[PDB]
């Protein structure tokens, strides 16, 4: 959307059926990645995702009105280390996503925890509600 | 026996070369790029482009391999199909040499032609062997 | 049917020097000179009389007599070209974005069509003069083919507006021929 024009590609951190935490107050707590938007691959390979990628998730744990429903989300944190163009390696404590509306605005009104800058640059509406950006 | 291949039909000339070879003679074919082939340009090219597998060519003449695209190779490959398939047909094939232009050592010698292979025999629409090799890949 | 004998005459006017040698016919005149080879006219005898051109053939089928009458039209075009010039007009039609055209040596460059930043370029054949007056383009010359081919190259380069769009009349189009000069 806004920063893909740089080298937007990192270590392949997440897959299909990988679990993530939902880092916002939308109601969900845990989810499972169902689809990766944009990937097109080769024989036997599972589609991958890293920071600032749009994904489809299915909520496995949360409030009754969001449990077992499919949403769009972007990856904001990842455990596996990735390198910034100025040569620094970053690593987070868990894999997390934030759930967005179809037009890109966050569904929740608050984001818990730190956010990578590549996610804040590509998704301006998320950066508007994020408090700390790393 | 020196054969001048200027303005001569490729197939008609080759049948006289083969009989000369079969009688135990050495045949030099000079001006091998000036012989003609009847038909339009497109007609002749697909006659030779359906043999293509792959592309490149990389020396002085000498091989004679599955895809001739040199004016010397084209003339030699045409004669080879008219020769006997026994062991003599291989010994006799070594007595034929084709050149582009007249070499230095054959400059002042008498050449022959065959009057029933002349370009005057056909209504028109032919190409030269040099023009064919230009499109096949030989720089000539 | 086979026409047993057919013969035609082309009158050479004054101020014109016609030369014929080994099937090559060249015509010299005030406006210029034209050289054309007629080696492909098999079965046709071309005679250079003292004051006219003579073309003869016998037992012509539908294809030999079709050839003979095209050679006649070519010769009469050479004579006309060296006495009077050929002048084709092209019109410049634009809807919203004005079109700019300019001549640079042996090339015509067309820019700012329906808005695109590509520059369209057209070849100019030898012996031809191209000038831009305004909303019109004028192509000069003695050989009719070179004048016609050059004006058609300008015509063809600007067609590309005719891709992916319902035509709203944007391009450069041929207009007329044959001013006295």
């Amino acid at each position: 959307m806004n920063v893909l024009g740089s080298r937007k590609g990192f270590t392949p951190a997440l897959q299909h059926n990988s679990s993530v935490v939902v880092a916002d107050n939308s109601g969900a707590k845990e989810a499972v990645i169902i689809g990766i938007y944009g990937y097109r691959g080769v024989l036997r390979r599972v589609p991958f995702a890293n920071i600032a990628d749009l994904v489809m998730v299915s909520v496995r744990k949360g409030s009754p009105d969001v449990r077992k429903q499919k949403f769009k989300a972007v990856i904001v944190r990842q455990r596996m280390p990735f390198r910034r163009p100025d040569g620094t390696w970053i690593s987070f404590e868990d894999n997390a996503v934030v759930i967005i509306n179809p037009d890109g605005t966050p569904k929740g009104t608050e984001v818990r925890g730190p956010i990578a800058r590549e996610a804040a640059e590509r998704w301006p509406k998320i950066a508007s509600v994020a408090t700390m950006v790393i | 026996v020196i054969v001048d291949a200027t303005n001569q039909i490729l197939g008609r000339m080759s049948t006289h070369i083969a009989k000369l070879l079969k009688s135990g003679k050495k045949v030099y074919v000079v001006n091998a790029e000036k012989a003609i082939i009847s038909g339009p340009r497109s007609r002749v090219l697909e006659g030779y482009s359906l043999l293509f597998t792959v592309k490149t060519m990389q020396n002085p003449y000498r091989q004679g391999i599955r895809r001739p695209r040199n004016p010397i190779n084209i003339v030699k490959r045409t004669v080879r199909g008219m020769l006997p398939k026994n062991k003599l047909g291989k010994q006799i094939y070594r007595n034929l040499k084709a050149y582009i232009g007249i070499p230095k050592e054959l400059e002042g010698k008498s050449m022959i032609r065959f009057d029933d292979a002349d370009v005057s025999r056909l209504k028109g629409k032919y190409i030269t062997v040099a023009e064919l090799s230009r499109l096949l890949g030989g720089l000539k | 049917l086979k026409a047993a004998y057919i013969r035609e005459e082309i009158q050479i006017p004054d101020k014109v020097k016609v030369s014929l040698e080994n099937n090559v016919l060249k015509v010299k005149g005030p406006k210029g000179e034209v050289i054309k080879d007629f080696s492909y006219a098999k079965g046709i005898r071309i005679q250079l009389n003292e004051g006219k051109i003579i073309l003869e053939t016998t037992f012509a089928d539908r294809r030999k007599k079709a050839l003979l009458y095209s050679i006649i039209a070519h010769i009469k075009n050479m004579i006309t070209g060296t006495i009077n010039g050929y002048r084709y007009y092209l019109k410049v039609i634009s809807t919203h974005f004005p079109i700019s055209v300019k001549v640079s040596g042996d090339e015509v460059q067309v820019s700012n069509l329906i808005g695109e930043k590509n520059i369209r370029r057209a070849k100019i054949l030898p012996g031809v003069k191209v000038t831009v007056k305004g909303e019109d383009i004028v192509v000069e010359g003695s050989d009719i083919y070179n004048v016609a081919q050059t004006a058609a190259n300008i015509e063809s380069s600007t067609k590309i507006v005719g891709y992916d769009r319902r035509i709203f009349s944007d391009g450069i189009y041929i207009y007329k021929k044959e001013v006295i000069g």
């Binding site: 740089s6 080769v42 024989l43 036997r44 163009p85 100025d86 040569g87 | 020396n59 003449y61 | -």
Partner: protein, 339 residues
């Protein structure tokens, strides 16, 4: 049911055989490229690798005018020795044979290092006087001029050898007569790297890659290993079928030699040419190589070959862009490579 998957490996690289020489020469050379007489290549030795911090030069780059981190390879390049002058022509048969070679070492350039490779000319056979007038007589039908050069390995102690390598490098520039004059001035002299290249240029690297011996099909072609049970089940590191037919059972993967192949690279940029080796040597030496003590090149990215591999550097034959000077370097990693 017969999904689609691309074939494993390139069909254009077969045979994957061992290279027949350690220093290959290019078969083709870049065009004149509108210059004045100069050589179109140089010879170097691969030392090691490190990383620098430069400010980006590419005006179209996303990181323009910013400090970015780049790996680099270090290539040690002493001067070479110009040995002979070689002229090519289209001979009878219409080929590209060699007309004559004009050697010049006797006036100055009496070397026995050169006799470790060639038991070269005696004083009796220094009749090179009439080789030169043959070149001048047969001028105007000469197509290419090439200079035979020799490396000087005895100037590199970490490279424990003294016999040299002999290659020929092409001259591209003005006229043929102009190129003959330039080639006679380099003859018997020592050619620095700065007479050929300059900082910021692009190059093409030709050499031999690191050898790896007889190998399987999972390393040679990256075929897929048999999944689950078959990981447990009668042999997994193999292909199932070897073709369908008796048509000369075809070009399918087989085990064999991996590495030590002649390859080529494109568009490798030179970032720095240095003489002060204290700015490039890491603490404790380059691991498994030694210390740099000659002129060196800093080439960004990777280079084929192992340490102490002779590399041929050539002008770019399909260049991507045309750089200008000064990719400014702000940091060089001089830390130890052990631990």
């Amino acid at each position: 049911r017969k999904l689609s998957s691309p074939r494993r490996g390139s069909a254009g690289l077969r045979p994957r055989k061992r290279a027949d020489e350690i220093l290959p020469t290019p078969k083709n050379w870049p065009l004149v490229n509108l210059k004045e007489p100069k050589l179109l290549g140089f010879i170097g030795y691969k030392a090691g690798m490190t990383h620098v911090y430069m400010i980006d030069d590419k005006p179209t780059s996303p990181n323009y005018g910013k400090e970015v981190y780049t790996p680099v390879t270090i290539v040690e390049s002493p001067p070479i020795l110009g040995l002979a002058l070689r002229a090519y022509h289209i001979d009878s048969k219409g080929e590209l044979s060699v007309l004559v070679d004009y050697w010049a070492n006797f006036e100055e350039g009496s070397l026995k290092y050169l006799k470790r490779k060639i038991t070269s000319l005696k004083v009796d056979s220094s009749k090179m006087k009439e080789k030169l007038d043959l070149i001048q007589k047969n001028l105007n039908n000469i197509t290419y001029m090439r200079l035979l050069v020799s490396t000087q390995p005895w100037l590199v102690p970490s490279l424990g050898k003294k016999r040299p390598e002999i290659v020929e490098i092409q001259i591209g520039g003005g006229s043929i007569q102009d190129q003959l004059n330039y080639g006679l001035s380099l003859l018997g002299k020592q050619i620095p790297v700065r007479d050929v290249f300059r900082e910021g240029q692009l190059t093409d690297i030709i050499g031999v890659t690191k050898g790896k011996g007889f190998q399987g099909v999972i390393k040679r072609y990256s075929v897929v290993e048999f999944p689950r049970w078959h990981k447990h089940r009668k042999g997994s590191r193999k292909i199932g079928a070897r073709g369908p037919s008796i048509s000369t059972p075809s070009y399918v993967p087989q085990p064999g030699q991996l590495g030590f192949h002649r390859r080529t690279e494109y568009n490798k940029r030179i970032i720095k040419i240095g003489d002060n080796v204290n700015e490039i040597n890491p603490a404790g030496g380059i691991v498994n190589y030694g210390l740099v003590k000659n002129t060196y090149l800093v080439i960004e990215g990777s280079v084929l070959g192992s340490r102490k591999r002779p590399l041929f550097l050539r002008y770019p034959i399909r260049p991507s862009w045309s750089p200008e000077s000064a990719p400014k370097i702000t940091y060089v990693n001089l830390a130890s490579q052990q631990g």
